[PDB]
Homo-oligomer: 561 residues x 2
């Protein structure tokens, strides 16, 4: 029952890897303490291998089976469709890993006969064989962090032809089933603003609210064969075409439950018997399993009037308090249940009685004020990681631009507005790349977005108030300022000065560039501007943006109007 | 998670019920202490309701899931077929309870258009609907026992049309799957001789053998919705026609898992959420579930080199001993595991180091000696219940003749040979009914058998040795003797005297009756006869007798 077994072969890189922060002429304008930023590399994979390898034991009780029966009842109301081959390779990211069988993501997106012919053969094989383990590649991820150093996280994924097959059989299912099963508890159906609204309303609904986040140590590794088969039983509750049921059974037996691990050089590194981090079902499966085990644990701990919010392996619960001391006792019982269900904690959970002090999905609720002075709740987070990554992206082009995803998701924040928008629009202006579409990620899915569309995107997601927030909380201001001193980032006053320049430069360009200056940087001037609804914003097809999670799922979309 | 919920309406009888031993002119020749014998009736159904009604809790661990995965791997090798309507109709007992829809077992067996048409409507309904709970009738069983008084057992069964549908969908499965999944551990594949052989050889396979019987407290009531769904998942591993998969899913959802209980008067008595005692899957389901929970518990207890023998809810385990003090420790862990699995004990299990001292399926192994003096092991049991029922049957005609089933199954025993054969052949002779086919039950299935066929049947099942066993063990002799004194049954010496007379009478008739006198009572004369293989014996189609269990399954043969 070990999560993994290893042969000793090394997890190898695909090309040259850098760990030290690359430095160019723009670096010091953003961050000076270069030695604090680093990128993980395959050199530390062995340490991660150690950490994710352990034995799992599961003791399933009546609460567990009761919750599951409830979930299946809701799953039975779902009707899902099979995706055509063309539909599935249109969801493939342009730079997804090429197939070992002579074609790449470009060929897939182009519907080339070679890729399409191979895909149909992979599909036919899934239908005719439900036993043979499917090969997977294991890689160390290159991710940037700030010190105080963690080893690289690993990604396990099947070949390209198989990935397109997963979409055909399960795309509709993983996009629809989660919300039907868990209702308001499914986190990925919300925009950051909608998430804040749900948390605040829930908090307010309790007479004496108490809340806690639960961090499961290496969630993927805690996922057992039982768990993966339970997930498939939920998927099979849906009204599905016969071929889809066959494909789902086959993919569960041959891929989801486990399989061999091959490095980039083609050597066998070992075997996996836990969740694969790079399959279409990683997000949905984790959310379902996290919801199941947590719901059952709440019952076991006798938690009163619980409301949960789940995003994959991330969980936050808000309930009725039973007194501070009693709540502490309740959490130990909750944790004991989770442990029995194979979901032990990394950091032990602690009860919070202030909503703003709860961090879930790396974020927390905070308050500011709009133009009218009205209090407004919004989503924020510690900016350390977003700034560390921005520093890297300042001197290196990366496959995914975290700064852009951060501006989109954290547009209302003090730090995203004053530092990220200021710094990157300055670089884009200098290279005249305002209209150059860049790749970013939202809830794990990849989107190609032109920076010029930001004002419209922001208005649609957060409302015009994102362009006028002020009087942030002392707690938030202090966290931002502390982080800047730690990283050696210039203080907010410097950013304000620079923004005025960026704004004027954008305005001088006229057109959409002007709108960017007008809306994104109104916070920079003494005499603020009007700021009315942008006409073209309504035409942006934003449906699909906040429907489901797809981390490790190999999903792409292009922004279209 | 309660086994049952009740409305308060009474479980009612379907006719007059007798609790006191009926007495005729023949009674006293067999039993004098008439007050020791009684039959359970609906008057005690309330008490039974209290014993079987409780809340179930289950904690399923890795050992449980590991065993289950192994079981499904084996079940995946099974290929089962659907029975036609005619084949299923033929399996229906001639006196099975009639349908509430205007036809009975005679009509079913005859393939009458009315019965066949309704059967088809029930089948079609099972395919189209997999949600609506199916109605069931709850009755108090009338069973005879010797005192020192237990409450009536309850039987729950669906309508005749549904019963025939269960046959079409699962007869082949419940008949084949158990032995495939459990191998030598499936009890119903053996005749009593083969069961003794398996127990003996298993005992010998251990360097230091240790064994124990495990009695679960009202097993049927401990069976949960989980258990019943796990059973269906095993059935589904088989290679089945899609129509059979649908019918099985439907029967599981609508009947097996639970359903309303209706009394004989048509009033709702409550709801069942545990095993129904009167459905086709009762035997196979109980066997699968008992084996799953036990196999897993053996692992949890760290029992060494275990070999199990399962017959429904009856369990026996023989293993490699690790010392008395450790053996007792392991058993305690085994019981704790079973309890967690929702199978608490009625009587605390105890380790035995003497094979003959283990009682399983109400029986135990004993030893006698054949003509040559060779030691021979055979299956016996305390005869208190068989004799109590024989007394009842002496004065009352019953639907099932336990005396006949007991002669067939316990033919090698001291008590079945000297008392049962003597007493009943005497009565049959006097009424000239040796050739009258009587109904009896073997492993729950019903068989119509002519007493004149007994010599051949016995030879085929137990060998010629059954007609010559002697020098029974002191323990077995003493147990038989104590039982006779308790019930007021004439001592064995009297029975031997009577056998000489019954024997002479049979021989006087000539033909098959003479054969009965010759083979069945050779033990009664001082100058024993030849006893050679009976030619006609080979003709008997006994294939189907010891294949699977069918208790409560409404199954009939020849």
């Amino acid at each position: 029952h070990h999560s993994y077994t290893w042969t000793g072969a090394l997890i190898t890189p695909c090309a040259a890897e850098e760990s030290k922060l690359p430095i160019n002429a723009l670096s010091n304008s953003l961050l000076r303490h270069h030695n604090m930023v680093y990128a993980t590399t395959s050199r530390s994979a062995g340490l991660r291998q150690k950490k994710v390898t352990f034995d799992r034991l599961q003791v399933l009780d009546d609460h567990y089976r009761d919750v599951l029966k409830e979930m299946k009842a809701k799953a039975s109301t779902v009707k899902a469709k099979l995706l055509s081959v063309e539909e599935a390779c249109k969801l493939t990211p342009p730079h997804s890993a090429k197939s070992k069988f002579g074609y790449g993501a470009k060929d897939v997106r182009n519907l080339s006969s070679k890729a399409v012919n191979h895909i149909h053969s992979v599909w036919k094989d899934l239908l005719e064989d439900t036993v043979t383990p499917i090969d997977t590649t294991i890689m160390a991820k290159n991710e940037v962090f700030c010190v105080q150093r963690k080893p690289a996280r690993l990604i396990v994924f099947p070949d390209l032809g198989v990935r397109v097959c997963e979409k055909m059989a399960l795309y509709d299912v993983v996009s629809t089933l989660p919300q039907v099963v868990m209702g308001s508890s499914y986190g990925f159906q919300y925009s950051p603003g909608q998430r804040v609204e749900f948390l605040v309303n829930t908090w307010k609904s309790k007479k004496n609210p108490m809340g806690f986040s639960y961090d499961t140590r290496c969630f993927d590794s805690t996922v057992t064969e039982n768990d993966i088969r339970v997930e498939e039983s939920i998927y099979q509750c849906c009204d599905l075409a016969p071929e889809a049921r066959q494909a789902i059974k086959s993919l569960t037996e041959r891929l989801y439950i486990g399989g061999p691990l091959t490095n980039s050089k083609g050597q066998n590194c070992g075997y996996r018997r836990c969740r694969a981090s790079g399959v279409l079902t990683t997000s949905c499966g984790n959310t379902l399993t996290c919801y199941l085990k947590a719901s059952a644990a709440c019952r076991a701990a006798k938690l009163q009037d619980c409301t949960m919010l789940v995003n994959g392996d991330d969980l936050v619960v808000i309930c009725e308090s039973a007194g501070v001391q009693e709540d502490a006792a309740s959490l130990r019982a909750f944790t004991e249940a989770m442990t029995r269900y194979s979901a032990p904690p990394g950091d032990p959970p602690q009860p919070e009685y202030d909503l703003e002090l709860i961090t879930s999905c790396s974020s927390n609720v905070s308050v500011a004020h709009d133009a009218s002075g009205k209090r407004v709740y919004y989503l924020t987070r510690d900016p350390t990681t977003p700034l560390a990554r921005a520093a890297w992206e300042t001197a290196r082009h990366t496959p995914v631009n975290s700064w852009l995803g951060n501006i989109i998701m954290y547009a209302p924040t003090l730090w995203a507005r004053m530092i990220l928008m200021t710094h990157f629009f300055s670089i884009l202006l200098a290279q005249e790349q305002l209209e150059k579409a860049l790749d970013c990620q939202i809830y794990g899915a990849c989107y190609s977005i032109e920076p010029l569309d930001l004002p419209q995107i922001i208005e649609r997601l957060h409302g015009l108030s994102a362009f006028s927030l002020h009087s942030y909380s002392p707690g938030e201001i202090n966290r931002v300022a502390s982080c800047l001193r730690k990283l050696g980032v210039p203080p907010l006053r410097v950013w304000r000065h620079r923004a005025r320049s960026v704004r004027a430069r954008l305005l001088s360009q006229g057109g959409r560039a002007a709108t960017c200056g007008k809306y994104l940087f109104n916070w920079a001037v003494k005499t603020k501007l009007k700021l009315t609804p942008i006409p073209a914003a309504s035409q942006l097809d934003l449906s699909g943006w906040f429907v489901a999670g797809y981390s490790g799922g190999d999903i792409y979309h292009s922004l279209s109007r």
